[model samples]
Target: VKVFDTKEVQDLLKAAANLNGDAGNARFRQIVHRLLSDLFKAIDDLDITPDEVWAGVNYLNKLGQDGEAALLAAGIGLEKYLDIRMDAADRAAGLDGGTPRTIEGPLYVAGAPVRDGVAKIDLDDDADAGPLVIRGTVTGTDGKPLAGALVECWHANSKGFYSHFDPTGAQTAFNLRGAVRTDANGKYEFRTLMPVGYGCPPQGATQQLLNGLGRHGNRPAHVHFFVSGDGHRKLTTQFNIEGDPLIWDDFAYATREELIPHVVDKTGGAALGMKSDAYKEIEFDIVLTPLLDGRDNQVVHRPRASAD
Candidate 1:
């Protein structure tokens, strides 16, 4: 409690972490040391009480159990912070002026059936929502269209619920999720319904904290994708629907102005061979940079669910 010299107490922390720990992992120990020191300094500076510290620990315990740890990470802007840092790093690597990559939130499930140049994300039998036609062309930084690129995409339904994460268990597996490979002109198209805005589970840990902080946990209508081609860097991005009231106020901090596409509410009538006469259309192009030496051209290696 600052009863002793802070320098000495810090050294005591170092010793506590390092004493007789030669066999321990060196890098991990270093990280732990830095984290411990900062935590100690924060506790000292902020007059953190033991009861408060324990209370925070208990919250973490429940949060971990609640399985909303990833949601909380985005609610506080950690994912967006990482994307900004990565933007700086990409600029350092001489990768600039393509489509801006945004947060690929934790809902992406791989192994969607890949269709050739056209993706049917919604079944014909489901006619409850507004029909939407989405098309895009993948381009390189030089404005050259990139053919044969793999475009993996997913989004929520009109009810703002993803298939696997839906609570009602009414959605079929991989409902409203699919992929499309680019044609010779680097174009891909899909037919689906307009996705709706969503909120975090009201009873979940992520929402509980947001409620305490006076922040509502809602995300506007959006579509997510990962695109990569031969010798091109993987691009992770998403686009928001243009007219949603909360389009700019996403609690996940994932919205970018460049990614939002214009929604032609009365466009593409009966041309795409769809069953519905009234269809909303969006054409959102994506640009990715070519691969560079000594840098990763692949998606970030993170734990993801398998459709297997």
Candidate 2:
């Protein structure tokens, strides 16, 4: 009789012996045992050994050494994947009716400015960030434009540095993170600068995982938004350009079905008070789902760090 000294072999034997008592339990154990058996069979056929296994071990250790921030690439795609699964579950359970969900990248900072109408959101503090006018309606699922809705927005600056994340807080300051109330007609719009895309930390866990998975980490130019009101479900979403090279392969993998931004007439004159070669527009109709029996989803934002 030969006894294996390895901890893994001993554990496998112990598990196999314990799982042999009941038919149901044994069937469950069979799957696990079969998976391990298949893995070993593949390794044996490939002539893999302890040294080959250690190389994988070292690689995983390096991935762990990479910080959480560094693992953005992996987490981004997985996060969106999880959201998709959640959305699917919601649809199956009849809980999927609301504003389409998208990956809310890790950089958004809550609370900026609150105005009744149009406000310039470009962080440059000059007219150079371009005059972006975002106008839309806060509507209920009934197709009626609902008024008195509160909307909040935020984004990264021209340098790809979000407020609170960038050491130079004053420059890439959290300027555009603000709120605005919808008018009686349920219509609202504002001005903000165009945003650019960015990649994850090159030396972090996200990047480390991306390297192992042969994936690139990058996000396209976009804007973020959140809408809320009484007796209506709140909406949190973002809009991205259709032509960004990374749009289909977003590191975050968060592009949703409803957020395709349209490139408006670039040469439109100052009729809307905008003097630009062309402009892009995204009209989002937020459909509010009914709240659960006695649950409200309203949240307030307070100043935390110097950047927010």
Best by TM-score: 1
For residues 1-308, write the lDDT of model 1, one tens digit per residue: 55234678867887967944668788878888788888887888788999999988988998989888888988989989989898888888777778999998888887788889997787524556788889999999899999899998888887788877889665776887888899999999988888888999889888988998999999999999899888788999999998899998999999988998888867555777666777888999999888776355446877676674
lDDT of each: 0.84, 0.64
Q: List the residue pairs that clash in candidate 1.
A: none
Name the 10 consecutive residues with the lowest summed lDDT in model 1. 1-10
Candidate 2, 49-118: lDDT as tens digits: 7898888677667665653542453354665665667568658767754777665555556556677855
Clashes (N, CA, C under 3 Å) per candidate:
0, 11
- Model 2 regions lying over 4 Å from their true place: 1-76, 95-97, 125-129, 167-169, 266-281, 296-308
